[PDB]
């Protein structure tokens, strides 16, 4: 039903193509992943979870022991945009608008009790209208998040919340707040905040910046499955050192998004109310297509 126009990239679950609907001219992104019917039932329910900051899921097609997901197509991703902005950075009003829009996307999904679980710049997609959109929402619950992609590329740990790294089995909406916080910091500084290259390196990078967590800041932490008394005990650093030249409001929100305790970490809804968004607007990015 579709002719491929070009390879878009390799996703966690399979290859993604820009394609034109061979009869209707419609340009879409087709993601190609026999599948368990649990994964079919779950994915199908996502066709209803529509929001302007969630990439629209157009169709799910189960055929020939393969699964195709047909999505609306966006022309750029946030990872590419950040690399393209390396030399001068993303201007603050655009960072602010993108953070605000993503939190609206989270507030929506969270309200329907759906989490993403694997937010990263690769799956935040942007258009010429100044919009940014969450892709892959809901796919982690459907297939798990594995250690490597189907092409054996490493699944990044850089945005993983510490409760997940600490072996927690039942994680909450707060894991998406943690990742988005990490992505916010990386847009501001132009460098990944916690670029771990193993689970313990990712944990220790977290502890080196935010302090080794203990029962004072996180009740129950010492009881988590992968917690070890023998973790080195690092002191917390100042956010003023971590994401200069972010302003006091943005530092305050960041600090709330990166609370160790997922019960104390700010909600997407609360975050939309933060003073940081007092003067939020919607600029246009410059994109070369
Ligand atoms: C499939 C749909 C969400 C979807 C819709 N657009 N799109 C883009 N657009 C940006 C782009 C990048 C290169 C060439 C042309 C456009 C990248 C992408 N990336 C995949 C793979 O890199 C990621 O898995 C997030 O879905 N997935 C998608």
Which residue from 138, 167, 162, 171 is spatially nearest to 257, judged by alpha carbons? 162
CA 29 to ligand 1 centroid distance, Å: 7
Rounded CA-CA distance 177/278 in Å is 20
Q: CATH 1.10.510.10 in the chain, residues?
A: 76-287
- Residues 148-174: b if buried by 16+ CB within 10 A, e if exposed: eeeeeeeebbbbbbbbbbbebeeebbb
Phi, psi dihedral angles at 85 (to 5 degrees): -115, 10
What CATH topology corresponds to 76-287? Answer: Transferase(Phosphotransferase); domain 1 (1.10.510)
Which residue from 17, 53, 59, 46 is spatially nearest to 139, judged by alpha carbons? 46
Ligand 1 atom closest to the Cα of residue 77 is 10
Among residues 118, 176, 249, 261, which one is catalytic? 118
Rounded CA-CA distance 71/135 in Å is 9
Which residue from 141, 140, 133, 144 is spatially nearest to 57, judged by alpha carbons? 133
For the domain 1-75, what is the CATH code?
Answer: 3.30.200.20
Rounded CA-CA distance 58/39 in Å is 17
Q: What is the resolution of this structure in A?
A: 1.8
Rounded CA-CA distance 33/36 in Å is 12
Rounded CA-CA distance 232/126 in Å is 40
Residue 83 known to be catalytic: no
CA 193 to ligand 1 centroid distance, Å: 23
Q: CATH 3.30.200.20 in the chain, residues?
A: 1-75
Q: Is 11 annotated as ligand-binding?
A: yes
Q: Which DSSP state fits 286?
A: -
Phi, psi dihedral angles at 38 (to 5 degrees): -60, -40
Rounded CA-CA distance 168/178 in Å is 15
Specify whether the CB–CB gap between 171 and 160 falls below 8 A.
no
Specify whether the CB–CB gap between 191 and 86 falls below 8 A.
no
Ligand 1 atom closest to the Cα of residue 135 is 3
Q: Is 96 annotated as ligand-binding?
A: no
């Amino acid at each position: 039903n579709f002719q491929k126009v070009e390879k878009i990239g390799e996703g966690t679950y399979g290859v993604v193509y820009k394609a034109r609907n061979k009869l209707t001219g419609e340009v879409v992104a087709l993601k190609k992943i026999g599948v368990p019917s649990t994964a079919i039932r779950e994915i199908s329910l996502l066709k209803e979870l529509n929001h302007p900051n969630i990439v629209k899921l157009l169709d799910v097609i189960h055929t020939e022991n393969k699964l195709y997901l047909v999505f609306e197509f966006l022309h750029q991703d946030l990872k590419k945009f950040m690399d393209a902005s390396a030399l001068t950075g993303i201007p603050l009003p655009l960072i602010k608008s993108y953070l605000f829009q993503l939190l609206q996307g989270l507030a929506f999904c969270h309200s329907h009790r759906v989490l993403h679980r694997d937010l990263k710049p690769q799956n935040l997609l942007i258009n010429t209208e100044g919009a940014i959109k969450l892709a892959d929402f809901g796919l982690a619950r459907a297939f798990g998040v594995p250690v490597r992609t189907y092409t054996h590329e490493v699944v990044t740990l850089w945005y993983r919340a510490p409760e997940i790294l600490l072996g927690c089995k039942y994680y909450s909406t707060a894991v998406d707040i943690w990742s988005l916080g990490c992505i916010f910091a990386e847009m501001v500084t132009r460098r990944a905040l916690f670029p771990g290259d193993s689970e313990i390196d990712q944990l220790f990078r977290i502890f080196r910046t935010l302090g080794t967590p203990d029962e004072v800041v996180w009740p129950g932490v010492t009881s988590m499955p992968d917690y070890k008394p023998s973790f080195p005990k690092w002191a917390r650093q100042d956010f003023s050192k971590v994401v200069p030249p972010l302003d006091e409001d943005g530092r305050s929100l960041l600090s709330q998004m990166l609370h160790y305790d997922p019960n104390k970490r700010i909600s997407a809804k609360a975050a939309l109310a933060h003073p940081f968004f007092q003067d939020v607007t919607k600029p246009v990015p410059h994109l070369r297509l």
